[PDB]
Amino acid sequence: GLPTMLTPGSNQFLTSDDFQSPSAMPQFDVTPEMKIPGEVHNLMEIAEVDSVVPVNNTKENINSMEAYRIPVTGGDQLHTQVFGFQMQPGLNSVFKRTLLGEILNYYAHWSGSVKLTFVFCGSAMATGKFLLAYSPPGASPPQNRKQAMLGTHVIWDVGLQSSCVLCIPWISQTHYRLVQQDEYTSAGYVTCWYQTGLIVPPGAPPSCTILCFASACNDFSVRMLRDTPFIEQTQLLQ
Amino acid sequence: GLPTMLTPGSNQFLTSDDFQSPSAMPQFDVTPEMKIPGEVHNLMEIAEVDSVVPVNNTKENINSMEAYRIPVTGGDQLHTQVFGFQMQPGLNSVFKRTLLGEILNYYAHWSGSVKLTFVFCGSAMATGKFLLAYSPPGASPPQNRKQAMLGTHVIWDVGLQSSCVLCIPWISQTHYRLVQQDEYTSAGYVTCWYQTGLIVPPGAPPSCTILCFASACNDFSVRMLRDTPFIEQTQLLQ
Amino acid sequence: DRVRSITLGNSTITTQECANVVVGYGVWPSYLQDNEATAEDQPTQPDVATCRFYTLDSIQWQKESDGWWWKFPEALKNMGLFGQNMEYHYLGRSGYTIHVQCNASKFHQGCLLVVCVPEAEMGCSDVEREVVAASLSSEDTAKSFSRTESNGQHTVQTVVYNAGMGVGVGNLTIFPHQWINLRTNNSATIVMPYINSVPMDNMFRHYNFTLMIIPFAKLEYTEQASNYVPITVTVAPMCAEYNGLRLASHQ
Amino acid sequence: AVARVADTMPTGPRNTESVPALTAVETGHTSQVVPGDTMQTRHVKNYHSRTESSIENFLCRAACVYIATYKSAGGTPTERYASWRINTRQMVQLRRKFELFTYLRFDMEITFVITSTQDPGTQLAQDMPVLTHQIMYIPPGGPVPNSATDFAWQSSTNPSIFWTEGCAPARMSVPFISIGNAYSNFYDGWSHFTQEGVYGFNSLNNMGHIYVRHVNEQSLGVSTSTLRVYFKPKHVRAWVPRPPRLSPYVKSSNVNFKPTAVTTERKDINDVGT
Amino acid sequence: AVARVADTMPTGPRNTESVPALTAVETGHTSQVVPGDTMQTRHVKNYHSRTESSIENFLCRAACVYIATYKSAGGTPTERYASWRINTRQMVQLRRKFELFTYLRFDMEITFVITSTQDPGTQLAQDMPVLTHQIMYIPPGGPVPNSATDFAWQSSTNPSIFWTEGCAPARMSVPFISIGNAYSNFYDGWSHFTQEGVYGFNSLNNMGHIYVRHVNEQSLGVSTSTLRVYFKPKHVRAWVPRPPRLSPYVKSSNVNFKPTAVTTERKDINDVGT
Amino acid sequence: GAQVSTQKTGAHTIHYTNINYYKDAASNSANRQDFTQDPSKFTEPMKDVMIKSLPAL
Amino acid sequence: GAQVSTQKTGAHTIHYTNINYYKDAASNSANRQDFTQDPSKFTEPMKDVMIKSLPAL
Amino acid sequence: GAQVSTQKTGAHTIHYTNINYYKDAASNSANRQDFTQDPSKFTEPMKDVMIKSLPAL
């Protein structure tokens, strides 16, 4: 018949090929597709959804509901930090188990800008102002509000609108960062400091609670699928 | 020659492929096709034919002709059921051995609406009325005619036309049901009760006989061929 | 704007501090088309007698509380004529509208997460066993979460941070959700369409979705203030239709 | 599209003289009653089809028809090769599928699956080349080989296929090779005109034989092999459908049986439980 | 091009009443704030894409779903073949990827990787031909083979693939074979209408079994083999995304677990070091 | 030679190509897409056409 | 039959050919180049369209 | 799809055919027939163009 020649790579099983195969049951009649609501076309539609960030994960708070809550208090204030964590959305104790960081662990590279939304869950008579800073990784982490005001920071006035989005920009020298980061592709730190402080009227609870959210912007991207280092097994499940 | 690459699935024997093969005896002259009457184009032309249903299959009646006959009687009546069976056309003692249920055991999934035709084989002077009910599987099976009148039921007046088709609808949440059914894809029950009762003149036989038929409608479908669990062997037949 | 009003049937619901209306995964509850239907017989469609607001039982948000859940449509078994069509018909299909309301004060504080979890399969507390139906959903009261681990042999694992399913409780925000912040919000309304893999399903052996209310930021106040902050749930079916009429079971 | 099923047209209430449910089976007629005649239905667009239930999709699946073993030993030359008078009656799974129809006319693909092993005993092989098998088809009347290494294994006109072990299974196509115009699965009659001889289909089966052997001596030990023949009927036309069989088969040349019950038993006539 | 990401439009200073950072999460709304609302940005032309993060590029990678072993020995005929009720719950790496979505509808390629060895003991083989394996799929309700060399291995209607050792792995395609309109990964409900029976997805799994055997006796020694099944879902549509799982799986038929911590611990809430 | 025909898909790039390589009609692939039917020969084998709504006798 | 489509290259002879050999739609290769998305169903599942610059409440 | 290009022969039926079978640009064969060059960047990396016959200094 026709003279061919078998190249290298024949009779192998590559797990991610796109080949045709003969059907086991031919002329099969499939049930018609009904319009089920909530169709996922892309995995970035899930990572663009805000989810609560366990920033208070100091044991013993990971076996309770207190991991998601941030303590703020009364007098006097402002020589104390509110919270602080590195910017590592795929490899961190803080937010690798969130909705953004779970899909990030299925990939090796990531890129884009990350949002952080902060809800103030105190009473409706409590005032306050905070400084929400982000720092590029060139230098040492800040230790007070004089070193933290030089980076990218917004000032959040708590009022009738009880949320503020600190949008971390994408500042790096590479187009992509690793998910399992290192000293090369480090992204920096995210800190929070008291601007003025909580002023409550008499008869109000003196201490409140801030919740943290994290999601992706519209220029987020992932690349290089891999398996997650999150779930394991030893033998087959019966 | 031409550089190819052998994909996975080479040199295998899939029993249901559609491949070309070189002819053993080439340029063979075949006898011409003559018009034999009774050509089968589809297997649903056989399952659409009524066939007698052994609803009286209580041993000892399966080793006789009495499996196909339904007893009806005289006085007084109507606190008694005529018959009753589950709706399971592929897996039942009643009608898996009929013409509809034999072709159903060659397939795994089935769908559509099933007909049940009832011939009254009593004398031509005997009157009577019956209730032919079908019940969806949501609740308990009925125990009298007050619980059986709420489902899908027809009323059959025995007269010059001695047949009545109780057409079981296709009511389910899935587009297909299994042939070997279970608690998930159960279809319900089919019962029969006396409406008024048999009134015969003097000199007539007091008891009669009803025959049951079963076939498919024009919206019946089967899917997923498999072997029947009906015939077996141990060694090769000599 | 902060004022809304939702009128269904012979019942209205008025609010004065509303966040918005989350509408499922985008779509509105509707009737089953002729393109997708598989039941052959004519479906019934009770407009006013079925699709109206039903007020469930009230719970108490304590300062040490951790969460509750209701499974639907099993929670409306004895609610009016919606529960009478479920027993008589083998098939059912409906969307819902879940209004959850909890007003406290300008001096109270707290937060809640009101999710609607489709096919919320729940895990047992004794592994290598199975739950029973009396431990998944009560007749009208709420099944609550526990702060510690559940020790029972046939109950749901009602620990709160695993949400009774094995997942992270912070990652429940994929589902249609609102937040009742007592600083800014008073009520939370969620319109859920019919989400299933089949076009219709028997609504006795299939909980379509589970409503969960979980306090992330707990409730605190001062001794001058009130000490009873209740939550009330008001759920209306929407575009409900049924098939397969037989005897009532059960009962 | 093709070949879909009928839709249920919507129906309201009625009070008519035209009753479609009341019929008469005595005419030998299966009724055309759809569910819209006995109850109120709704307009659904049924998108199901009957592509999986046609004749060609039902029979175009390969099934085993024989299992034949042969040796490579010394002595007893009947064991050095295998024979098969060609049947579709020895394996039951294809025999029952054919016997739903009276007549059949089709082409065929025939796949040979040969699987060997090493026979035990002293003086084993320990280094053997690959085996090669010759599978000769003898049309009715040809020279039958008495043993392996015979003159009839030349096959100048008999079609033979040679197949080394380790490759894909051998496969060829065969046309409709019958004398008549349909493979008669059933033949209610005799072989002689005096109503004597062979009653049944065994007189109509004149298709030839199949012989399989090792073309290699080996010279040290014995290796048995198992030929499994597979039949896939394609381009199938079928006539006069029969009822499916009830009692289990006994012989490969008869429809003889033992009388079995019509179904399996159940407790009562009204046995809707459980 | 498709499907690229949005560019950051350039931004100068501002003093507006239209503040985009201040929002309200209480409405259940994720904000659409790009970095140009809270700081001065520059016009970059972002050429990145989301082709690697679609549904079809995420799931079209083959993963193991079972590991089955079987012998070629004499005695204990349950070891002469292997069984598998078809699941996607026994191996965790594909179970966790499916369970991010509630419903799934796809086609599939199924690759069988069979790898044998020689069993120890006296009376070894020392010269064996190649092995051949039959991998029969039984749709739900069919005849189950009790052992090897059974009548149910004919497979006139069950799809079977025969595969000699040394060639490429066997591979076929399977359509969307479910009863409903989506493979329900989660099923919050029961099997009986009285709220009794089997709670969970194990009542919805009615896909059939898979049986694998040696078609050759051998006649001298024993050789074990290990079938590894691989699943690649293609033409994938998915609905209703779920949170990914936190606690490790225990059973292959349950979502039962033991309560685990939400994350890993760290030293302080303000722990930017080191 | 290129007999472009349509594939099998379910109703809510669907074409394939097929060449006949051998010189015999029995060498071809199976006719899996011939979906004709005529069930009137076994369901209604009457001399007179019977109407559903009209009575039989 | 020759469905000439474009390959995958990065934006700063790019066409390939594909034939469908088998008669079933499940036999085809993967639909790796369908890149639609609609994230508004989960990000903005509201009844009223919310503007960024306008206040929410 | 048939990208007919010329073979490699020495200056004193020279065409070949090439199809792209796979959906990725990294799957292609090597670009062995792109023979551009620009040696002025390393040989003459000057700000002013230098003439051979004119003196440098």
Ligand SMILES: CCCCCCCCCCCCC/C=C/[C@H](O)[C@H](N)CO
């Ligand atoms: C070594 C080369 C082998 C060539 C294989 C050809 C041998 C087989 C020819 C006969 C097969 C034709 C199909 C026979 C069907 C049954 O005989 C009929 N159902 C009975 O009439």
Ligand SMILES: CCCCCCCCCCCCC/C=C/[C@H](O)[C@H](N)CO
């Ligand atoms: C020897 C021939 C073997 C033929 C192979 C076909 C057997 C496999 C058929 C079932 C595979 C369909 C995909 C199943 C997926 C899971 O069941 C769903 N995720 C659960 O509903």
